[PDB]
Amino acid sequence: HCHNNNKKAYDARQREQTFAKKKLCIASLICFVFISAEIVGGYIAGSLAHLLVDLSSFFISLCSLWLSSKSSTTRLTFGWHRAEILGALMSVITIWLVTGVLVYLACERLIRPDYTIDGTVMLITSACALGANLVLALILHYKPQTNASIRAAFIHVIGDLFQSISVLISALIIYFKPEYKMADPICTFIFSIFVLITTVTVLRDLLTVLMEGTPRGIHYSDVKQSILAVDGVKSVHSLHLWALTMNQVILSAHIATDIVGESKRILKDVTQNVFARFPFHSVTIQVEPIEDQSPECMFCYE
Template sequence: MLTSERCLSDIRLTENVDFRTVSSLICFIHLFQMGYYLYSFISTLLQPHCHKGKKSPDIDRNARRKLMIACLLSFIFMIGEIIGGVLAHSLAIISDAAHLLTDLISFLISLLAIYLASRAASKKLSFGWARAEILGALISVLMLWVLTGVMVYMGVERVINQSYQIDATIMLITASCGVVFNLIMGFSLHQHTHHSHGNDAENPYSTESDNLKPLISPTGSLVENKTSYGTVQLENNSSNRKEHKKRHFNLNVKAAFIHVVGDLIQSIGVLVAAIVIFFKPEYKLADSICTFIFSILVLVTTVTIIRDILHVLMEGTPKGMSMDLIKGSFLEIEGVCCIHDLRVWSLSLSKVVLSVHLAIKTGTDPMLVLREAIDKVQKKFNITETTIQVEEFVDDMVNCKMCEDLIV
C-alpha cells in the first residue's frame, strides 16, 4: 500500500489535479483511520467484564460505551468538517460542524448524567444530581443558538458582498464523508436502542409489597386506638431504582440517536447543495441558502426543547400526566373520602415525583390504603418517587380553601 507521503509526491507530478482537494481527502482518510483505531481501543477498554461489573453494578456500561464512542467520532469528524469547511470556504459545512459541536456537548451531558445518577443524595442535595442533565441541556441549546446566530450573520454578509470563493470539490468530499459518518454512528447507536434486558421496559417502577418500607409517625396511638391516629406515611424506598437507571441510560442513548438522525438530515442537505454547486458553479448562493434553512430548523426544533427545560425547572406537571386521572385513581381506593395537596412534578425529563394527602374514613386500615395507592401510582403512571400521607377525614376538609382542587 502506498503511503500518504508517496501519494502526495506522485500527485505533485500529475497535472490537472487540485493539490488542495487531494490533500483534504488524505486528511479525511487519516481522520477516519484514527477514529477507527480509537473506536477499537475504547470498545475493548470499556467492554463489560465480570470483575469490573461487580465494582459498579448500578452503571449501564454498555450505554456509557456507546456514548463515549459517539463523543469520539463526533469530535474527530467535527475537526474534519472544520478543516474541510475552511478549505472549501463553505458556511454550510462550517454550520454543520457547529451543530456537531452541540451534539458532542449533548453526548458529554448524557455521560455526565449517567455518572451523576450513580451518586447518592446528600444532606445538601436531597434529590441528588437529577437536575444536572437539565442544566447541561440548557447550556447546550444556548450555545447552539449563539453559533447559529454567528452563521446567519456570516451568511447575510456573504450574500450582501457577493463574496463566494467556494471550492465545490472539497465541499462535495466533506459533505459525502459527513453522510457516511452519520450513517456509521447512527448504526452504532441504533443497535443499542433495540436491546432490552429482562422486563425493564415493561414496568420499571413495579413494586412488590415486600419492598415497601412503612414510616409511621402517629400523633395518637395507632395500635391501641385506631380512631385516634394522626398521620401515617409510607415512602417508597425505590428498591427498583437500578432498573430505572438502566431505562434512563437507554433513553440517553436514544436521545443521542435522535441527534445523529438530525445530523444526517443536515448532512444530506449540505451534500445536495455541494452537488448543485459542483455541477452549476454559478449557483454558489445555495451554500448560504442551505445555512439559512438549517438555522431556521435549529431554532424551530430547539424552541420546544427550551420550553420543556423551563417547564421542568418551574416544576410543572409532566406532559401526558393528568392530575384528574391521578385523583380519580386515588378516590377509587376503598375508604378514601377525599384527597388534597396533590403535587406532581419533574426532577428531570425522565424522573417524576408525587406527593399527596389522602383523607380516609374512620376505621379504615391506613397501611392497606397506602399499599394500594403506591401500587396504583407506580404501575399505572410510572412515577419514580412517591410520598403519600394518610390522615383521618374531618368535616372541616369539605370547606377548607387549602384543600380545594388546583385551578386549571
Template sequence: MKKLLVAVALCSLFIVVEVIGGIKANSLAILTDAAHLFLDVTAFGISLFSLWASGWEATPRKSYGFFRIEVLGALVSVQMIWLLAGFLVYEAIARLHNGGGEVQGSLMFGISAFGLMVNLAMAFLLGHGHGHGHENQHDHHHHPQLSEALLEENGTRSEKKRNLNLEGAYLHVLGDLIQSVGVMLGGAVIWYKPEWKIIDLICTLLFSVIVLGTTLGMSRNILDVLMESTPQEIDADKLEKGVCEMEEVVDVHEMHIWSITPDKITLVCHVKVRPEADGDMVLDKVIDYIKTEYNISHVTIQIERQ
C-alpha cells in the same frame, strides 16, 4: 457509555476535517455542519457526565441527589445551539448582501459525503442504544425497586421516559445526517455550476432553521422539569379520581407530581380515609395503584383520618 465515547471520538475527528475543509472550500454550509457536529460532541459529553453524576450519593444539602445535572446540561446545550445558529445566520445574510469568494463545490461535495458516512455510523451506533436496550438500562438504573413484571406491564409508559441529553444527542445526529445530504447536493450543484454559489448560503439558512427546530421539543421538556410541571404523560385528575374511588378513601388533596428528571417522577399527597379504615392497608393500596398504573416509583403519602 462506551458507545458515547466512540461517538465523541468520531465527532471530534470529523469536526477538525470539516473546519479545515470548510475554510478551504469557503463554504458556510460546511461550517454550519461542523457547528452542529460540535454540539453533538457537547451533548455526548454532557450525557456521559450526567450518567456518571447520577451515581453520586445524595447529601443533606442535595437530598434528591445530582440527577438534575442532566437537565442543566441539556439547557446549556440548547443555548449553545441557538448562539451558534444565530452567528451562522448572521454571517450568511452578510454574505448575501456583500457577496463572498468562490466556493469550491468539489471539496464541499467530498467533505459532506464523508460526513454522511460518519453520521450514518453514529446514527446506527446511538439508534441501537436509543431503543429498547436503552430504556431497559435506565429503568434498571433509576427504578431498581420495581419488579420485572411491573416493568413489562408498564412498558408503554416507561418507553415515554428518556434521558434528555441522550435524546438531544440522537436528534443532533439525525439532523446532521439530513444536513450532510443537503450540503452534499448543494456541493454537487456548485461543482457543476460554480456561479450558483448562493446555494451554499441558502443551505446555511435552511439548515440553521432545521437545527433550531430540533430544539423546540427538548426546550419544552427542560422547562417542564425546571418549572416542576406535572409530566405530560400523567393525567393528574384521573390519578386523583382513581384514588378517591377506593372504598376507604374520602378525599385526596395537596397532590403534587413533578420530575427530578423525565425518567424520575415524584408524587406527594394527603389521603383522607374513613375513621374505621386500616391506614397501613390503604397506604399500601394507594402506593401500589400509583406504581402499577402510572409507574411512579417515588411516592410519599400522608394518611389523614376523617
C-alpha cells in the same frame, strides 16, 4: 416497611445509566477518529472547524452523566439525579448559538460575493461529512421514555446532517449552472429553519421538568380515581405530582377517612393500589379525620 416497593424503581434506573453510558461512549470515539481524518487528509485542505464543538457537546453530556452517580448529601437531599436534565439544557442552547453565528457569517457572504472557492473541495468534504453523520445517527437511535441525555446528543447529530445536505445541494447546482451564484447563500437559509424546528419538541418536554410540571406518561385524572377506588377513603385534596427526572415521578396527597379506628389498614391498602399503575420513586400520604375537614378553605380548590 414502606420501602418494599421501591426496588422496581431502583432496579430500572441502574440499568439505564449503564446502558446509556456505553452507547454514548462508543459514539464519542468515532467522532474523535473522524476529526483526526481531516488533519491527515492534507495540509492546505486542512488549513482552511465546526467539529470542535462536537467534542464539547459529547463531553458535557458524558461528564454530567457521571455526577448523577454521586451519593446523597445534607444539601441536595434528593440527590444529584437532576444533573442530567440541567446538563442537557446547555447542549440544546449550544445548537441555537452555533446556528445564529453561522447565519450571521452567511449573511456577510450574501452582500459581498466571493469567487476564490472551488467546488472540487466542497464535493469531497460534503461526502465525507455525510457518511460520518449518518452512521453516528443510527448508533444513537408501559414503555419507558428515552433517556434525557441521549435525546440531547442526538438532536445535535441530526443538526449537522442537515447542513451536510445543504452544502451538497448548493454545490451541485453550481456545477450544473455556474450562473445565478446569488442563490448559493439562500440554500443555508432554507435549510436552517428546519434545525430550529426540530429543537422545539425537545425544549418543551424538558422545560416542564425543570418547573415541577407533570411529565409525559402519567395522567392526573387516572391517578385521582385510583386512590378513590378504596372504600375507606372519601376525598383527596392538595394532590401534587412532579418529575425529578424524565422517567422518575413522585406522588404526594392528602386523604380523609371516615373511621378513625384501623387506620393502618387504609394506609397499606392505598399504597398497594397506587403502585399498581406506575413504578413510583417515592410516595407520601397523610391521613386526616373527616370531622376536621373543612370545605370553605381556598387551598382545596383545583
